[PDB]
Design an enzyme around this catalytic site. Sequence first.
Site, PDB file in Angstrom:
ATOM      1  N   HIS A 167      -8.217  20.366 -50.148  1.00 43.38           N
ATOM      2  CA  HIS A 167      -7.059  19.803 -49.633  1.00 43.38           C
ATOM      3  C   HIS A 167      -7.342  18.409 -49.208  1.00 43.38           C
ATOM      4  O   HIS A 167      -6.436  17.480 -49.777  1.00 43.38           O
ATOM      5  CB  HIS A 167      -6.882  20.469 -48.348  1.00 43.38           C
ATOM      6  CG  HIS A 167      -6.265  21.608 -48.206  1.00 43.38           C
ATOM      7  ND1 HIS A 167      -5.284  22.265 -48.704  1.00 43.38           N
ATOM      8  CD2 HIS A 167      -6.731  22.889 -47.617  1.00 43.38           C
ATOM      9  CE1 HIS A 167      -5.100  23.494 -48.633  1.00 43.38           C
ATOM     10  NE2 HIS A 167      -5.764  23.898 -47.792  1.00 43.38           N
ATOM     11  N   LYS A 217      -3.495  36.893 -49.980  1.00 43.16           N
ATOM     12  CA  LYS A 217      -2.622  35.910 -49.414  1.00 43.16           C
ATOM     13  C   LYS A 217      -2.550  34.860 -50.422  1.00 43.16           C
ATOM     14  O   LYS A 217      -1.471  34.492 -50.749  1.00 43.16           O
ATOM     15  CB  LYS A 217      -2.840  35.756 -48.108  1.00 43.16           C
ATOM     16  CG  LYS A 217      -2.158  35.012 -47.179  1.00 43.16           C
ATOM     17  CD  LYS A 217      -1.892  33.491 -47.588  1.00 43.16           C
ATOM     18  CE  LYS A 217      -0.966  32.736 -46.294  1.00 43.16           C
ATOM     19  NZ  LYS A 217      -0.647  31.383 -46.834  1.00 43.16           N
ATOM     20  N   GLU A 271       3.906  25.293 -48.230  1.00 43.71           N
ATOM     21  CA  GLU A 271       2.496  25.165 -47.927  1.00 43.71           C
ATOM     22  C   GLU A 271       1.973  23.876 -48.888  1.00 43.71           C
ATOM     23  O   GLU A 271       2.144  24.188 -50.114  1.00 43.71           O
ATOM     24  CB  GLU A 271       1.538  26.248 -47.905  1.00 43.71           C
ATOM     25  CG  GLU A 271       0.326  26.355 -47.915  1.00 43.71           C
ATOM     26  CD  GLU A 271      -0.481  27.666 -48.064  1.00 43.71           C
ATOM     27  OE1 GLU A 271      -1.541  27.698 -48.141  1.00 43.71           O
ATOM     28  OE2 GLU A 271       0.106  28.855 -47.914  1.00 43.71           O
ATOM     29  N   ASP A 295      13.381  39.192 -54.510  1.00 38.18           N
ATOM     30  CA  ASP A 295      13.430  39.766 -53.229  1.00 38.18           C
ATOM     31  C   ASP A 295      11.907  39.583 -52.938  1.00 38.18           C
ATOM     32  O   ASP A 295      10.972  40.258 -53.484  1.00 38.18           O
ATOM     33  CB  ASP A 295      14.004  41.145 -53.160  1.00 38.18           C
ATOM     34  CG  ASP A 295      13.782  41.669 -51.793  1.00 38.18           C
ATOM     35  OD1 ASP A 295      12.727  41.656 -50.939  1.00 38.18           O
ATOM     36  OD2 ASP A 295      14.250  42.887 -51.633  1.00 38.18           O
TER      37      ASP A 295
HETATM   38  C1  YPV Z   1      -7.333  22.236 -56.696  1.00 31.89           C
HETATM   39  C2  YPV Z   1      -7.258  22.410 -55.172  1.00 31.89           C
HETATM   40  C3  YPV Z   1      -8.505  22.934 -54.566  1.00 31.89           C
HETATM   41  C4  YPV Z   1      -8.631  23.570 -53.333  1.00 31.89           C
HETATM   42  C5  YPV Z   1      -7.383  24.699 -53.010  1.00 31.89           C
HETATM   43  C6  YPV Z   1      -7.581  25.821 -53.777  1.00 31.89           C
HETATM   44  C7  YPV Z   1      -6.519  26.644 -53.535  1.00 31.89           C
HETATM   45  C8  YPV Z   1      -5.415  26.267 -52.710  1.00 31.89           C
HETATM   46  N1  YPV Z   1      -4.380  27.207 -52.370  1.00 31.89           N
HETATM   47  S1  YPV Z   1      -4.055  28.987 -52.333  1.00 31.89           S
HETATM   48  O1  YPV Z   1      -4.831  29.266 -53.542  1.00 31.89           O
HETATM   49  O2  YPV Z   1      -2.957  29.312 -52.133  1.00 31.89           O
HETATM   50  C9  YPV Z   1      -5.276  29.410 -51.158  1.00 31.89           C
HETATM   51  C10 YPV Z   1      -5.077  28.660 -49.809  1.00 31.89           C
HETATM   52  C11 YPV Z   1      -5.930  29.017 -48.796  1.00 31.89           C
HETATM   53  C12 YPV Z   1      -7.027  29.951 -49.035  1.00 31.89           C
HETATM   54  O3  YPV Z   1      -7.643  30.257 -47.971  1.00 31.89           O
HETATM   55  C13 YPV Z   1      -6.926  30.631 -50.171  1.00 31.89           C
HETATM   56  C14 YPV Z   1      -8.147  31.766 -50.178  1.00 31.89           C
HETATM   57  O4  YPV Z   1      -8.772  32.005 -49.505  1.00 31.89           O
HETATM   58  O5  YPV Z   1      -8.200  32.404 -51.270  1.00 31.89           O
HETATM   59  C15 YPV Z   1      -6.233  30.336 -51.160  1.00 31.89           C
HETATM   60  C16 YPV Z   1      -5.510  25.207 -51.950  1.00 31.89           C
HETATM   61  C17 YPV Z   1      -6.549  24.314 -52.030  1.00 31.89           C
END
Ligand code: YPV
Lengths: 409, 410
Positions: free
Chosen positions: A364, A251, A74, A267
């Site tokens: 992102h 998640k 991811e 695991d």
């Molecule tokens: C410094 C980057 C700032 C933005 C950012 C922050 C976290 C992540 N990843 S995450 O924590 O795995 C994650 C991913 C999707 C989600 O919907 C959620 C949630 O809803 O809690 C969490 C990706 C991008």
Amino acid sequence: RFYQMSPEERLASLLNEGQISADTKKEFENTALSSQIANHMIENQISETEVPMGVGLHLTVDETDYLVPMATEEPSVIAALSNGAKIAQGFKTVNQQRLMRGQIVFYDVADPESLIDKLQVREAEIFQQAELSYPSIVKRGGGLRDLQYRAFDESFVSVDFLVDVKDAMGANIVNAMLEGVAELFREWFAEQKILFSILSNYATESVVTMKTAIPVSRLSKGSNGREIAEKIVLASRYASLDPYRAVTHNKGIMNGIEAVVLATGNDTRAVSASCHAFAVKEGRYQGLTSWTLDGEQLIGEISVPLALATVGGATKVLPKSQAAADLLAVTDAKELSRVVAAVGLAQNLAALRALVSEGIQKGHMALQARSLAMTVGATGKEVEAVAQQLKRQKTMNQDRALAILNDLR
Amino acid sequence: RFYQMSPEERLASLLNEGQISADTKKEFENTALSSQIANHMIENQISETEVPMGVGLHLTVDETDYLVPMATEEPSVIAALSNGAKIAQGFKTVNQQRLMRGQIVFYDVADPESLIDKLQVREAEIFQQAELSYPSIVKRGGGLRDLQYRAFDESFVSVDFLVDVKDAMGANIVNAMLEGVAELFREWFAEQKILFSILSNYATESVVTMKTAIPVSRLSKGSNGREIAEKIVLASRYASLDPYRAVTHNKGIMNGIEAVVLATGNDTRAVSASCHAFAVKEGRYQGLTSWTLDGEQLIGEISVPLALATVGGATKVLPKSQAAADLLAVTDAKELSRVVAAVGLAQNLAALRALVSEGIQKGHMALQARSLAMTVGATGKEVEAVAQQLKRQKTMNQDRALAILNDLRK
Ligand SMILES: CCCCc1ccc(NS(=O)(=O)c2ccc(O)c(C(=O)O)c2)cc1
Ligand SMILES: CCCCc1ccc(NS(=O)(=O)c2ccc(O)c(C(=O)O)c2)cc1
Ligand SMILES: [Ca+2]
């Protein structure tokens, strides 16, 4: 028969029968894990899945710094962990236990109290049989620690075994112990009926609780860090009200936890099952973390069952597990659980800060912009200059990034 | 500046700083996924994890036969799936839905009823703008299907979006749509405040229910199939009583489900989160399957939310995902979810049968005996010959298996 064929024969058969193309066969042959190892570990083996592995940065747990191996497909997970760890600066252990659980379940029990009386007066013999059924764990200072008893439905009795499995996850130890004790139970109680004897993955005696305390100024580049902290608190509380948010909140935590679990050869299903089940509190699926404002600090806490391993399972037989464990610099499983729980809390912090600020979508996009700047050759202050300009128009690609860079050069 | 370095520079830096040994560096360099792909997918990339992949056999779903790619590190999972599928003979779809969920959550809402009234009279505009924020999905016949509204204690309102994302998992579609609609909401309601706008992984509109019906004689090689079926029903019922069993029961299901999800390039955390949350029924974590007896058949049913993908994410950019998809040969994501749910039920059947019969430990060792035989070079009739001899005594390792094999060849 397919089960008895070599991997090569299996792939040739699939191609001959029209089940895979020649290109698919060639890709299945493109592997880095030894065929002998892969074919030993699983059944009907033909190939492998490759999951990218990167390094999570800036994590500090009880004043020790770590470099965290993270296997994920991811985008942004690893950058987000690094961002959350850097904001938080460090994590502290609140509490930790480490025992693994198993059960022998009797059924059609006419009088559960009477059966429990017969077991309880024989506890010394049960402990001795447990040792005989797996002597090596006792030699190494672990083994059965406690027996508990539960009755259900005027039919069932669970004999609960709490076991110190040292640095292993414990499935083989616990299941061997339970099978040996069940054999003794069948001798002692020829008219009682045992339904099954098996480990429980709900490792409620392997819970670890970790926390962080963050000056609110660290939550924004501007002057509104307290107002971001208040919104993080609200978003975390909202997970206690709405399961549609709680599932996503957890998640996100698991994106970080599972990435380290996978990289270290642990695991992933066991951790997922124990953590998501532990999220059920007061009859409702809720978030696994809490966030509160105390003075001028944002306080975060996570509590998760992490019956993780540094030995056994796939932690050594897969060479990449050993390589990840070298990087992480952890050989003690209790320490591994503390680190992994801290990863989950750091991941959650990065997620919640972004959610209530610019949004995860824009987060992102900012990572994509920086990547594009680096790809087209920006260095130093050029990277942030190109990325910031990329963010000002909606379409981003290498052509545009290079045009910005060359205009600035 | 670790995020800027090349993967080679990252590994050289870790070695130079004493964080990894030379042998670890060489192992991290031993990779089969293209560096260009891996380094573009994730951040701070250095290597890969390799998870063995095998083929689950004997699965039939709605009268179509499948060969199931399964990526797992755990022994016995794939052979157990194959065993359960063979006993079951086939699975049938009971029901299926496929929509993804997102939410825009307002906070500090003085009057939730008034806010909901203002949103509901503007649904046409919400529908017009959700399209503008991601037009390709509408062109492909998908898009926003429904808006729902929930108010909470503590002054929150959730606007729930139900979206047809076709064959994608839907994160990019849903998140883009929500962001665009939230922008419109901010223009409309200057005194309201949006806390966040994000997808939900709790895909309760992507539930699939699958069933099987098994003549009880198939549950034993002896004459006691009905007595095994009765014990399977009781073991499944016990998961409704004791969460310590329910968690393990569902973990077993997920050994099979996650193996296919991983092999096909799908998001394993999303499936785990949705399935385990869905296990909570009437305030208690329980099993995801039910087993009963009816008409001298053992009847099994599973119901799980499976918002899975055949496009997007890692389903195409990782070459092994495309290879797994070739082997599996599903037409669309709805079909993938039906197959994966059937895998979960077949897995559970194999586990429960073993638990109430010879036990899981004995089942693992029988498989290990065959695995050891093949690892040391047994072929054809030699596999069972070595395995049967291994099981006559206690030591189960490669040295003994090879001694037996060489002796049988003399
Ligand atoms: C410094 C980057 C700032 C933005 C950012 C922050 C976290 C992540 N990843 S995450 O924590 O795995 C994650 C991913 C999707 C989600 O919907 C959620 C949630 O809803 O809690 C969490 C990706 C991008
Ligand atoms: C033909 C093989 C017979 C024996 C057997 C059967 C199933 C599995 N795998 S499993 O279903 O993933 C699994 C594993 C461990 C578990 O504790 C459970 C559970 O408790 O439900 C389930 C392994 C061996
Ligand atoms: Ca059937």
